[PDB]
């Protein structure tokens, strides 16, 4: 039931692919939600990528419950922005993740990027970026002039550093390269620092993080027009009875999962078919106790 809690159907798309901007998931841009509905038919059509602590990234973004995104402008010195690959086709032409910028060499040179971007606002800024893992040394040189890459995303509180690992990977969408995605949060008054020499697929900005009631649910259930305070992967249930047997997974004002298939609560007295000591009177109807 959609009415009480704002449902967002993740049709054909995962939550991470929508965040990154898989061309299918363009419709989800800057849309907020109360509960996301990951589908099992959902697939990833874009560049092959893995992301360490995927579950944490997924669970963190779901708790915020919004893909609101404001673009920021970085002066990428002497590098070719908007890098594209045939792996993520877009209608006719080839393209890339909508929220990431593939930085490659410009005129056979890759200068060390030392870029800065502060956070003057009172709320936390979440930047989503990654690193490219070229399949072979030849592909590495072809993309970036220098031979070995180095990426160090820093902030006043913490620092992340990744080294690209070159090697063969199984061809998926005919692309044997890989991409490791990471995330960094920039607290207010803090400042983001990126010093890279290459292999950097830098971001196009930050996602506005709100600490909210939203969550996620893996389900193949359809959605209809109705009002029900509970949502389970099997479907929506009513919150009348205080115990449920449907599913371990709940969302909202829901009864607690019990192994028992049924629990009969007595609402009348002991039924004794035919004074009172021997049996009760079946004929009596207007009341419960009486005189004959």
């Amino acid at each position: 039931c959609d009415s009480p809690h704002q449902i967002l159907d993740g049709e054909n798309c995962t939550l991470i692919d929508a965040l990154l901007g898989d061309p299918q998931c363009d419709g989800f841009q800057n849309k907020k939600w109360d509960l996301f509905v990951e589908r099992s038919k959902a697939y990833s059509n874009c560049y092959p990528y893995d992301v360490p602590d995927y579950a944490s990234l997924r669970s963190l973004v779901a708790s915020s419950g919004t893909l609101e995104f404001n673009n920021e402008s970085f002066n990428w010195a002497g590098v070719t922005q908007n890098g594209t690959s045939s792996s993520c086709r877009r209608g006719s032409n080839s393209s890339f993740f909508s929220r990431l910028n593939w930085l490659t060499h410009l005129n056979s040179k890759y200068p060390a990027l030392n870029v800065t971007m502060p956070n003057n606002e009172q709320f936390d800024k979440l930047y989503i970026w990654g690193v490219h893992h070229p399949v072979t040394d030849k592909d590495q040189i072809f993309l970036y002039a220098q031979s070995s890459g180095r990426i160090t995303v820093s902030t006043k509180r913490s620092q992340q550093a990744v080294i690209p690992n070159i090697g063969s990977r199984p061809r998926i969408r005919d692309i044997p390269s890989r991409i490791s995605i990471y995330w960094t949060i920039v607290k207010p008054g803090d400042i983001l620092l990126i010093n890279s020499t290459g292999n950097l697929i830098a971001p196009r900005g930050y996602f506005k993080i709100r600490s909210g009631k939203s969550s996620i649910m893996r389900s193949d259930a359809p959605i209809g027009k109705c009002k029900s305070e509970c949502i389970t992967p099997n479907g929506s249930i009513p919150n009348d009875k205080p115990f449920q047997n449907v599913n371990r997974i709940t969302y909202g004002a829901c009864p607690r999962y019990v192994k028992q298939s049924t629990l009969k609560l007595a609402t009348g007295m002991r039924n004794v078919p035919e004074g009172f000591i021997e049996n009760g009177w079946e004929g009596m109807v207007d009341g419960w106790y009486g005189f004959r």
Partner: antibody
Amino acid sequence: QVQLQESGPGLVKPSETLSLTCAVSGASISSFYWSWIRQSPGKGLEWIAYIYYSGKTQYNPAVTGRATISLQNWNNHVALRVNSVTAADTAIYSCARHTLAYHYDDEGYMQPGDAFDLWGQGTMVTVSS
Amino acid sequence: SVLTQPPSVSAPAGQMVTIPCSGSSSDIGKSFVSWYQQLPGTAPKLVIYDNNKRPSGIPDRFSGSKSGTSATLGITGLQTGDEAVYYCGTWDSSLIWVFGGGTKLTVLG
């Protein structure tokens, strides 16, 4: 070492739209509030509008709603278009930076600053035919 | 021009000057103040941000003040290079920026 350089046309036919940009250097355009101010012989020194990457924007009422401030990320420029130009609109047009406000607003964004940090030289626009 | 300031003042080199900036209570009484110097043919420069504070590279020679509806800019020990126009300005009620008329500072001697 942040600088501004206002690129602009020299003349503009009356009742037409006026295109304008100023290039920013050594600083992301999204990091500060920007506003345009224009100086004219007569009619004082006139602020027109301010912008911020949030989308917050205020225009001066004395200039009709014809002015619309944009800002662009690819070229790292902040831009300004004003349609239906009259003869009065002739002036030098400069872009300038606000002092960071150091106190957010409703919904978390930084407010516009109470002072103009630095100015570009500016470009003279002439309303001639 | 909802901010009043005298068109021109004059003083010998090495002396003090006072530029007043009269306004209503809707602007200065509520908001802060800023002073801007525009040397001839150059982009206007900021001289005093907020009420008494001066940016880096602005000598303590320049000094500012506020008092209800009026604001005051002061310069001790004048140089010939200080000949310029000086603008006071601030926000008002409607959050629209207003500058003063202008003050053409001439230095004699």
